[PDB]
Design a protein around this ligand. Sequence first.
Ligand SMILES: CCCCCCO[C@@H]1O[C@H](CO)[C@@H](O)[C@H](O)[C@H]1O
Ligand SMILES: CCCCCCO[C@@H]1O[C@H](CO)[C@@H](O)[C@H](O)[C@H]1O
Lengths: 42, 42, 442, 99, 423, 146, 49
Amino acid sequence: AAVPATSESPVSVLCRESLRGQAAGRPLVASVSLNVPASVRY
Amino acid sequence: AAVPATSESPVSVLCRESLRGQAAGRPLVASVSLNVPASVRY
Amino acid sequence: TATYAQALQSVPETQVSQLDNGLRVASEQSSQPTCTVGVWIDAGSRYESEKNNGAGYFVEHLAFKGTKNRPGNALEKEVESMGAHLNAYSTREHTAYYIKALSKDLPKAVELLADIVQNCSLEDSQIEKERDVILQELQENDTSMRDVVFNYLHATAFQGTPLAQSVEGPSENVRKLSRADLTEYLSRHYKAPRMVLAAAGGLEHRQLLDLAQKHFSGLSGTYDEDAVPTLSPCRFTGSQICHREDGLPLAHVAIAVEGPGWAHPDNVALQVANAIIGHYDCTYGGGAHLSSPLASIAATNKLCQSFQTFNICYADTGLLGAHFVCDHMSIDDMMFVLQGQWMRLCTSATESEVLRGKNLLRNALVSHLDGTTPVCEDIGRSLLTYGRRIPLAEWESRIAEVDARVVREVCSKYFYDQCPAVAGFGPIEQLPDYNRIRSGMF
Amino acid sequence: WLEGIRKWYYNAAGFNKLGLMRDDTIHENDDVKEAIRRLPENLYDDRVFRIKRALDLSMRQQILPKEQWTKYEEDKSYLEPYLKEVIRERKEREEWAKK
Amino acid sequence: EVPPHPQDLEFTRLPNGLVIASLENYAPASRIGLFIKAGSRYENSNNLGTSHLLRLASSLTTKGASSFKITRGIEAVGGKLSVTSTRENMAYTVECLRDDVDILMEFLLNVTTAPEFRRWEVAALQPQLRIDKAVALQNPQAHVIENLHAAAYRNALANSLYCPDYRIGKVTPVELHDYVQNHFTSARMALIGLGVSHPVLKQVAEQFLNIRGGLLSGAKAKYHGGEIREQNGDSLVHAALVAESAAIGSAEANAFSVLQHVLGAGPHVKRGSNATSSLYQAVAKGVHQPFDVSAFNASYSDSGLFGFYTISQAASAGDVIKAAYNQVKTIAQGNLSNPDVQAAKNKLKAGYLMSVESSEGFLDEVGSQALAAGSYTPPSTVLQQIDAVADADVINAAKKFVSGRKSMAASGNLGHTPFIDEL
Amino acid sequence: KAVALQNPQAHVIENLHAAAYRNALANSLYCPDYRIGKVTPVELHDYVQNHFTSARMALIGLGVSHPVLKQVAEQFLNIRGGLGLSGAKAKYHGGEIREQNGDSLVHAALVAESAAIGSAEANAFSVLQHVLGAGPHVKRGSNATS
Amino acid sequence: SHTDIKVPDFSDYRRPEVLDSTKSSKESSEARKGFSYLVTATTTVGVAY
Ligand SMILES: CCCCCCO[C@@H]1O[C@H](CO)[C@@H](O)[C@H](O)[C@H]1O
Ligand SMILES: CCCCCCO[C@@H]1O[C@H](CO)[C@@H](O)[C@H](O)[C@H]1O
């Protein structure tokens, strides 16, 4: 819709801090939109 | 070399007769040549 | 340790004898503890009419399914249990059945070939089972663009003659062929004077001959005089057959001019010429540096996935040319460079490229006759084609005498301003028009 | 005075005033183009910058401060080993092309 | 007629460990092969694919001959230069008329001891890795055998003969130089020749093949067991089930070789029903769609894999696989006729002799024996050893398979392809 | 698929499920490469008729009146073939899938079968997850309580 | 099967000298090329004039 995704796709990490949060913790979810960048969580 | 390979490469079976002999039976071997088509046995 | 010339004389001369019924028995003795022995017959689809076209191929499916002395899988079990291998092949002019086995097992091997060749069962139910096997093989072969294109090449180059026929035959024949057709065919063609019992390996000619006398003596040496199947020459027609199918990823093209026939001396120079142009495929390590101009251009410019020159011989004719596989946008370039190369050999072959061709040929000849099977086959087929085994030293003499002049003259004779036969299959919208192809011949 | 005239010539030629090294000024033929293609990243990137810097000075009809001029004694042939081999390879092919 | 051869094979081990073996057969052509302990098993996870690119680089520039010269010079004499790799060895072989062996030998020495691996030539070659691999992978068997080794081993023999996709374009000139320096050393090589004099061959090795250093080291291959499944939809499923058997050379290895022929190891008659193939007959009893099955036997220096390979319509994979397995089970339970073992031995013995009757087959065998056991064992002896295998040994090899931890790989529409724990 | 797969986590989670189950939950959220270009109109029509049925749906709404939402469902979401072509139990199998690709960083997941959602045991696993550590709470923190 | 493909009969279009499928067409090739090329040479002569 009106809101663009946090990160627009196209086709990093060098420290512990930037690495924390990268490990997955829940099952995967894939989203596709008409107006918004796709996403995959977990 | 002078002799062309059994099968020239480029980049199925419908009967039991044409299928006999397709099952592998020995470890794989890969060949590369200067003058002859490459091959992979087994 | 000898030189190349000295080694040619190292070759044991091939021994030939003939039984009263006219069967020829030939062998080449080595020290091999294994051997290959088989029967080569002057029979093939070129001998078939439209009505029984496919018969020989049908017989091939029956040959090892049981004999009167060894019904059903009996023959099979015997060959397997002694660790032997039984094979067969049928071309448009020759049929062969051969066994690979321990030399010590030669007597049994010769007995089995004899049993197969004279007492094959041809059981009605076996025949019906083989109909379906042959029909499935026809469907499989339809997926082989190379087999399709070469059968198409023969169909148009030799249109209206027995050589236009495929070896397998039309599907309708496979459905209708009867046991009677097969026996009539075998009756007229499987005669002692049209067969050669050949063997290569650790064996002696005297033992081979005694086994021949022992097992093939009753082989018919006379159909009579009303049968004696004789081949008429087959007219070659400059023509073109294009099977357009844009659904296939790569195009296959085969082009050829009429060749001389088996026994013609010209075949040596043509083989040298074909070795100069050579073969090629995307997996060759050479690339831009290959000696053949067609191969280097093809590799650097990515003109094809592959190509091969060929010299297919028949009794008094043949197909001399090349086959290539490429992208739909490269057909014209490939044809352009290929014909340019034939033209260049006709008018400008150099001594050095010709020596290279001669060296390639020498190496191909000797490396091919490596192992009992290839030598056994060379014996059987050569007696049928040349009437004798031509020794390596003779091939060497024939090769040595070829020079640039001979290559230009022989190429000019067969390629220069001659009508070719062309076959195309796949995304061939870009295959040049026949007139344009014909003008490329000069 | 040949070595004496050499340093004189080097400065008279003046490509050093634009910060160029002698090899940056060679006429590009096919042998040279192949040699440049063969250069390792760093030598290729440096060459690109020196040429770009020189083209920029040329457009402004200006030159670098004298302390930045390429020094005769420090100018070295970075291209020579590559070009010499490219030429050797072509000669070899040319020899083979004679029968 | 009366042949001159037959001479005997000559064998020599130099002080540096290099073996030189040859046979003057007086043939018009000669065959020389340099066998090396440099197969893919010697790659580690940091340089996977290196031996594959190396296999494709035999034609690149060397210190004594340019890339252009290697091709033109070998072609000028109608010769051949080829590289064959197995998980354990690499064999550089050349072919030519006997008067030109000095030319071929020189190129062979340059390729194996003086390669330059020029940065730009190496870069230009990377794309060939994709073409070479795609051509090989058109054969489902290649997919399955490669995955089977990856599933069976934790390392070494686990490595593929083909470069991993992620490594294509990444193999560096340095990795190639190091691979050659690490493994192309005298103690790891065997120079084999046919149609050549031994003194000459020997002298060549002494002067040009004295390469010191490198590593004769090499981590044992750790059999692990496991399964890799490649779903891809083909109407036909290709599958292989194996267990660890025996290292080549051992006596137990001969029993597995006999077991393989008892079971059925390839056709003997064109379009035949495989009357004497124990595995084939068992499957044929239960399945009526087209199919194929064969015992599978792979023997290596420090391990081996034995089992069976099957090809069937997707819906019948499980039926075919279980049937083949049950048939090996009956053998393990002692159900085996001495006649069948005799038939099997006949097949094995004839098959072996036929495999070395061509110059190519002979060279490979000598070369392989030279590296695996630094010696030459003639046919007579091989047949003896085969005869020496007892029915009990066969039954036991079969038991080992049945009770051994398995490894499996299948490709196709696997909806009905059983997992190891369902067998 | 390529966009999703730039995240190594996607690679790993997808392979973990393929390794854990024999079927069902084993399936990837992304189309297998070999199937790209092969999914037919018929397979799509069939998938919809088999699963988009009233007994397999829930219409949820925010900022809307329930009667209206309800009336909409009754008039337009009464889809027969309902209950549709349901599936089978997911068979936990266990196993491992290793994807060698050279990144400097290795991503790995180790699991065992736990409990179906809803069950009480599932809540214990959820608690165990937070005892162990389930994601950061402080920007650039040391995860003192993980 | 592709082996069911046969080239249609062209006897109605063939020059008479190549009507016999049991005879070599090479025996008449020079005569046939000579005829057509003669038409070409004469034309070129008339055009040069
Ligand atoms: C124009 C043809 C060139 C003449 C080549 C004949 O060559 C000769 O043929 C003999 C018969 O097999 C051989 O025994 C002999 O060694 C060989 O030199
Ligand atoms: C596919 C990898 C490249 C194969 C090595 C040959 O490399 C080629 O050698 C030629 C000399 O004859 C050079 O002129 C050319 O620039 C070079 O690319």
